[PDB]
Design a protein around this ligand. Structure first.
Ligand SMILES: N#CCC(=O)Nc1cccc(Cl)c1
Length: 209
């Protein structure tokens, strides 16, 4: 059973701007997703400070980067607080409507796409490099769900019957044909060292056979 939703007009406009604008500095997508993961890890850590049972779904707080050249996917896994179904539908837990409004004024007032994260909509920079994005998520207060969009104005949400996650979020980037450099180990290492050197959680770059 799959539910199909329309993006809010303002979010559809944000996504088409990211996809259509000529902008060479695409590598910032990874900084933005890692920062989102760090934010989600901060949230579950804070909750566990007064309620240790919040970590019964997993004590380890970490970020994994998993390239797969056969599937042409880059997966960013974190064990953060995760998202409920309501969070997923409500623009993946963001205030994307007002964030987009602010972001798009900044773009006409000088800024560039790389500054997207300051407006709370950094997730959508995934469409700089991905033709399709799948988000698998598990929050302590809900079931495991899969969100998916190839842009084009709609997304789907379904109950996820795949591998149970315990707690957290998995962003699966189905990369564009000309963006496979972000599956190469030395390119990912360079980007993490350049933009994410001070993230306070272990970032593990998986290797392939
Ligand atoms: N807001 C707004 C419009 C805008 O320029 N968005 C944009 C464009 C290219 C890349 C990114 Cl990451 C974002």
């Amino acid at each position: 059973e799959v539910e199909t939703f329309a993006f809010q007009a303002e979010i559809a406009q944000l996504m088409s701007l990211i996809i259509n604008t000529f902008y060479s500095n695409k590598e910032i997508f990874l900084r933005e997703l890692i920062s989102n993961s760090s934010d989600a890890l901060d949230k579950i850590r804070y909750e566990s400070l007064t309620d240790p049972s919040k970590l019964d779904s997993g004590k380890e707080l970490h970020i994994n980067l998993i390239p797969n050249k056969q599937d042409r996917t880059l997966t960013i896994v974190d064990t953060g607080i995760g998202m409920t179904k309501a969070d997923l539908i409500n623009n993946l837990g963001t205030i994307a409507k007002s964030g987009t409004k602010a972001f798009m004024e900044a773009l006409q007032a000088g800024a560039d796409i790389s500054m997207i994260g300051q407006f709370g909509v950094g997730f959508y920079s995934a469409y700089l490099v991905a033709e399709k994005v799948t988000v698998i998520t598990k929050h302590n207060d809900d079931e495991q769900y899969a969100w998916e969009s190839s842009a084009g104005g709609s997304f789907t949400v379904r109950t996820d019957t795949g591998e149970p996650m315990g707690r957290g979020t998995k962003v699966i980037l189905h990369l564009k044909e000309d963006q496979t450099e972000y599956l190469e180990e030395r390119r990912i290492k360079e980007i993490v060292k350049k933009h994410s050197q001070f993230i306070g959680y272990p970032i593990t770059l998986f290797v392939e056979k």
